[PDB]
Write a protein that binds this ligand. Sequence first.
Ligand code: HDD
Ligand code: HDD
Ligand code: HDD
Lengths: 726, 726, 308, 83
Amino acid sequence: SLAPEDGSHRPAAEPTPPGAQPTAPGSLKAPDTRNEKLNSLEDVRKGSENYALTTNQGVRIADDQNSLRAGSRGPTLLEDFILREKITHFDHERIPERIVHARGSAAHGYFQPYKSLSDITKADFLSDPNKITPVFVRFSTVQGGAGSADTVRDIRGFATKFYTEEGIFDLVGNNTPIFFIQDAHKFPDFVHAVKPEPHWAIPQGQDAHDTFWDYVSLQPETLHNVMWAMSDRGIPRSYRTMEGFGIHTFRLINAEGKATFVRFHWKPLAGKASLVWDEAQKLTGRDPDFHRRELWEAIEAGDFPEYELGFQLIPEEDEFKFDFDLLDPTKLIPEELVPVQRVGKMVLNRNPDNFFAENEQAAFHPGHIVPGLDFTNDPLLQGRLFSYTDTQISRLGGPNFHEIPINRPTCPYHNFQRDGMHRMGIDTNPANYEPNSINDNWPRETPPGPKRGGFESYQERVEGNKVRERSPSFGEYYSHPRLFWLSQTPFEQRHIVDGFSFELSKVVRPYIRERVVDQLAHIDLTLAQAVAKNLGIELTDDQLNITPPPDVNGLKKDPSLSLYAIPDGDVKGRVVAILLNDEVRSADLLAILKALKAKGVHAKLLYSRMGEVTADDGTVLPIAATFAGAPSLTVDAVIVPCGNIADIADNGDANYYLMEAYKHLKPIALAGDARKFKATIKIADQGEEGIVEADSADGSFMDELLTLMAAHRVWSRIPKIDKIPA
Amino acid sequence: SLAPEDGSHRPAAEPTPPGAQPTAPGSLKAPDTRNEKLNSLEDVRKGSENYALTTNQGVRIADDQNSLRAGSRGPTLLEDFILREKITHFDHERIPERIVHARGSAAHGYFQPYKSLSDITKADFLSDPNKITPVFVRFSTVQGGAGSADTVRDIRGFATKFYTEEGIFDLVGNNTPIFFIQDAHKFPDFVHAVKPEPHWAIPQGQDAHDTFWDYVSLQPETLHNVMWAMSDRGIPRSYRTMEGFGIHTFRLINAEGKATFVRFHWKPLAGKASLVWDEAQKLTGRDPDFHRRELWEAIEAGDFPEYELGFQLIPEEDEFKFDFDLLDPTKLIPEELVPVQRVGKMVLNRNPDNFFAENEQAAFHPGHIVPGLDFTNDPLLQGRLFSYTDTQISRLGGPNFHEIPINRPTCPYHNFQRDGMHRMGIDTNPANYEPNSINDNWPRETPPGPKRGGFESYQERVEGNKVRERSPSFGEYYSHPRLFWLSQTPFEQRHIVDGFSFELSKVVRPYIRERVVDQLAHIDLTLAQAVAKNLGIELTDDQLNITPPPDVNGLKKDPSLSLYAIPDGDVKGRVVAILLNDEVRSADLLAILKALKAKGVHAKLLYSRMGEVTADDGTVLPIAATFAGAPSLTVDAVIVPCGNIADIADNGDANYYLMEAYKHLKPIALAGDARKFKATIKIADQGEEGIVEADSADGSFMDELLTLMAAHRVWSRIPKIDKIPA
Amino acid sequence: SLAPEDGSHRPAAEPTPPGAQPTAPGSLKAPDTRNEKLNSLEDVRKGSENYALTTNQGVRIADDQNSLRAGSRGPTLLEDFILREKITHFDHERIPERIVHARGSAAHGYFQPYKSLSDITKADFLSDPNKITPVFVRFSTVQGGAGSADTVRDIRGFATKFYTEEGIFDLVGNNTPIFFIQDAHKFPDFVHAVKPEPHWAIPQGQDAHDTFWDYVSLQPETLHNVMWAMSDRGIPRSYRTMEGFGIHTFRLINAEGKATFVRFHWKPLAGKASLVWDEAQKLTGRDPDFHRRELWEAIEAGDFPEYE
Amino acid sequence: ISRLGGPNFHEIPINRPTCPYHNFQRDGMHRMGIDTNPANYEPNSINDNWPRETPPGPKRGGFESYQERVEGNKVRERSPSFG
Ligand code: HDD
Ligand code: HDD
Ligand code: HDD
């Protein structure tokens, strides 16, 4: 018995806030959170407590500390089969990572529609507001390996496996509404250009290098998603605070056989929020697991990630009514033209038990659809359909990857397919072919119908010659980038310009930077000029004279394309650093902590060392982390309570904490003599918007602080931060 | 509905004789035959009746006859995910075959001891006669591929997986009591020498080629097993009628820690029986699946394969009491010196459901032992311990092959090993290492003990220098071959000579044949001379003068080494061909079938066409096969009833049936006018031992036939067969 | 032609200081730098300039920008074998990373002894001061994945393959002179304890978590190498400025059959130097490829890494 | 991909073309060819876009599919002419 006698090794099996208890496998942390998929995994869940340690063949091991040798200082013997089994399993633990989105974090949850959608689709999982469908969702970055950092600038994946009663449906989306390229034949080129360069394998998790911008400069179709990635969309605060999109136009098919075109959306109920670049980049060093950690801890705290599924629906007869082609995945459908109709809610409420078994081995593929859905001729979607089945043959070791437990349907599956590596199902059917008489032709085909019918493809008319040709309706590259640019606030536009400027500064061949700037001048001259000024490049008179691309269907902006133009803040689940001193005003700390708790905001008590400090009144304050150990990068706001401020006033870490939080536009609140830190951040005596200050933490101090947190960051501080040495 | 109205598509779920019903998966043929392992496989058995045909993701298929195309004569579309999943699974069905023993046939059963062995071993499965241990047994040839023929001349494997309460123990043996080589380092040399030659990959399932005999001629340690392989041991009648051996000396360890040396035996309760070479060779062309078929149908009929497990036990103090080294796997322990103690019985009573999932994927390995067993320094066994865990990583795809259902232990298994390709178990342990505090160190090591204890190696003393050197005690090659030769009946010696003669005649390089005859002259001059005579080789005076090797501990024979010297014939499960005519004497047929039924012998009614014939009293006799369709090779004896003999008397195929059966030494019985067929096989009017003839098929006629069948073949016939052109 | 007319896309094939030119494949940056191993790879090196783009079966491709479809807005056809070959190869690019030391940076070079060692060893590569042996060296971290950062706190691997005339010798060492554990049977326990924890797969490239310190606390044999890892040895400035060690005692065997015990060392001729923790940790965010980059650029500059 | 272990099966010697082959495909299990191209994508400027596409033509040209006419709905249907 090596556990502490007080039982403190084991986290409580109840919701607890971030940092309050060690994290644990979901079935131990939250044994009563169930759904039909979680329950179906019980056949493979393995416990440990009270069991003997064995080999994989069930033989009990007596001494798991030593190899078998001839003499206690002698050579290891070949006959040690316990050693060799254990080292062999170790030696073959790794499987190939995903070719793209190798870095990702996943959770289980459930989805339910708000009302039946039978009028527009026969998909069973959308047929009844009381039908609950379990989900497994993985969120990811794109470029970096499985061991890369989370808060890089990149697109994010947002992949949802719906375990429906009529089959698995995987909605395999990203967090921006378009992709970089038009036709899947170019996917290896694009991916190779953004991935680490092939001679030296640098850089990891960064588009900031020559080959990515070379390809962008040569393929202007890429510019629209490049605009999104260079905005603060590329650096989300959390997977809970980003949008999701299926990108492609798909079809819904109802029981009468009518097709409606659809694009899929996820709206985050926590709101949209992103980091700023300097914070994101520094956070990749201070905590490369920050998004993975934040998702796991939100679920352990009960701050369940919630998202609303929504559809943009366009009738078949309106296919050609826009200035862009609906089948072109580099174009978005502005919500001002086609609104998102709310469909249902997804809540992620339990972590996995074992990351490798459930996250690493999960296989999502957008070809996994169900009756009631269908594809379109989008030429990027069409090639995706080939890739996601083919890649699993190496990644997951063969054609039986649907028998890996996380991938299994919860509905029935029966067919004539047999064998393959790793075959788990032992088929008893006398027949392995159809048509057969020897088993009365079972299992049997099922005609299509309104419910529980076979899959039949929508009978779309095809007419044309066999060509490798891009549709001319796809040959427009700048109007969507411009619509995105004009829809952003002034501070978002600044962050875009700073994104392009920072990334192009890392491109060693200057002509590439020049070619990118020339493309920017086809989108918007103000953008192009601002980036050029940061790169020391002067636009030519020709460039100054490029006419801007047209409006998109009459629109000159669409505010739903901005993260921040329309307030959607939610403070629940956010966190505040509280910088302690060795004699904290206890009345301040009571008021601060209860106000935060009332709004579901978490706190971390920080000091210059671990252990405890004692408040003016004798209250013992346990310390969560030191100032350097939990930097301001990891919090949303900073509060400094009154007390003995001299204890920390000359602490360089405490001062720099406030300087970093101030640079990154975070709300900062200072009570009583903590206002002596105004000099560290150069705040005027009469104060400034974004800094809460008062004689004590009472009255409206915490409400003012919370109001600032609901607006996420103090954008008005931006011109004040250039001078700050931080 | 495609099944026939009358239900004749589905075999009865009751025991039935070979040929009476179509064969079926074991759980459908014998649903009520149960054991703990078969019951534990219920989680992975999948049915089929009444279920819809789906993709592997659970989506119902409407049309499983057509690809999706643009127009009904148009090109196939990439978006056809149904067709690609089905073709992808097909394209990846095969896995590598086993390096050796790739051809094999398997069944489920159970083992039970006759008495507790706790005085000599603490192995839990041998602790109590009421301990029932499920087994899965795979019988195999050695050289040929998984698609090669069964009745080749070869060594046979006999591998038994015991699913004990203290771990899987695999007894991985062959059907002769020694192996070809002494040290595992030479196994790839020997196996490459016997396998198809590397330039052109010929010959399949045959040792009859230059490289095999080149290795043998240069490595006289092989000669003992080569003598077995050249005897009729090399061509068993059935997996049910051969012996099995573990070959190596292992140890039993009791609760006191005392080690006893043990060699393992399986004694077939159906008796020992083999084919003759011509019959075996021709059977590889008429039915290359004969042993697989015979095993499956025996079990379907309730002719369960039964074997007694036997131990030769040698106390530790007697290690050096023999003329040969107990660790040398090319030496046998004569039963006259150390008797086989009969310790328990194994019954194989259920065929698999799916060959690939349960037989092809089964992994047996002799390093899978349990507490109460241990290894010795036998240098062939020592190297085997490395190979059987290593080879599964490619064959079965990775280190989780114990999770493939058929391989899973039925007792608990818990450890800190994680991940690997197609990981099924989802571990919930917070710890994946020990020692750990965070899960109170579970699962925990267990000290060795008398029951349910951890495995500890027997503390054998090792003293010597690090050397690659063969023990001098292994350097004797001829005395065991000679003891084997002297123990055979005269007809068994003739078949040995004929085996050597036929094989060496296929060696194209004559000096190799000469070098083999020289080795034979070191074993026995009579043998050497008889082989040389058939090869047109004359022994030199030096060869005529080689002194024979010494007796083995005073023995100049041991009849336990002969298949036939001691009567152990059992006719239950054997099969007779009854050659019909278009007017059968029904009284003969009743008397024949009655007497066969009484002894559990099966029959097959044969004619010149399929369909039925009608007997003299009107009984309608259904025909199982034609003369040419079910050759005499496939039966144990032939009976010709009386009736309209002129119907068949000039039938070449019916005459040849009897000539072939007669050449192969099979009993033949002829009733009434069927005695006209005496002329085709040249039998004198007075008759001949092994031909049963009488006026009708009365009761005496059948006892005489059944007595011949209990003696298997009519060996006295051998000098008459030289004249038969068949 | 997409290249700039001034030729500024292509780096000079001469030694240049870090940042002066874009980095390039070895054989194009330093075509005249050769050794027996580098030459022997010429059978499989493949160029590109002036060659047509083809499938892997050697069929020239006319249009590498589009899939084949039925009409220019139509569905992609299964008979597009060019698209499926290209996407199949992409789909199967990745292989499993190394179980440990998955993050590493490598280079070619050569070794030669200062004098013959025939009195203590008959190894051919140590027999003659003028017999040069090619080498390939990979330096690595231990815990993190292939896409983790370079300037973590960790032990570093230092593995040298010597391509000798009497076979390959691999000296597979680390940058500290001992290991954490005594018996290989415990390696999966120790590695599992230091690797990301199994429920949530955190933390990457860091021993700073409960399971590693749990194992340490319960296995005091670890403490020596834990001391080295917590010192600035854990955060070297460059792979050029750390020591290497084989850790184990091995044997040298001379022609007379005498055995001498030996432990192997590499001394960096650039000297020993490490970062400080705040700088190392912030560098994993500002340039997670810092040691990979510094090694490649030192070789491009002519600052060849040398070790005794 | 299973039978020959991955996507570099054209590098097994019997399968290799005797004519030139050059493209932007990289890596995979058992990769033999060591690409020196600074670029592993096209279009690129950093290797002047080599290796380059080739127009179709009478000899030594790029592959182009015959522009057969396709007309019909997306169906899983046997042509009646096959019946
Ligand atoms: C033709 C190839 C191709 C194209 C054009 C795309 N992808 Fe993809 N994608 C892959 C081929 C691929 C892949 C090779 O099949 C991956 C990696 C491994 C896997 O299982 O699938 C994958 C993974 C992958 C994942 C991670 C799934 C997971 O968590 O396991 C997401 C979220 C996306 N992709 C999303 C997209 C979106 C939104 C695209 C454009 C609209 C896109 N993919 C285009
Ligand atoms: C050092 C290597 C080596 C040596 C010396 C032997 N074998 Fe072996 N044997 C193998 C390496 C191997 C193997 C490569 O590991 C096989 C092939 C596939 C498998 O799973 O194991 C195997 C399969 C195999 C099987 C088939 C098991 C099955 O049905 O799947 C049997 C019955 C034997 N062997 C029996 C023997 C006997 C009785 C030996 C000598 C006394 C012997 N083997 C020596
Ligand atoms: C019993 C298992 C075992 C143990 C006890 C060790 N290693 Fe190891 N090592 C491995 C099992 C391993 C491995 C699983 O075999 C690796 C990863 C995959 C590979 O090719 O080798 C490996 C890789 C590996 C590499 C990377 C080689 C490369 O760059 O590819 C280095 C430098 C070391 N190890 C160094 C050590 C040192 C100095 C050890 C202690 C003195 C040590 N290893 C103990």
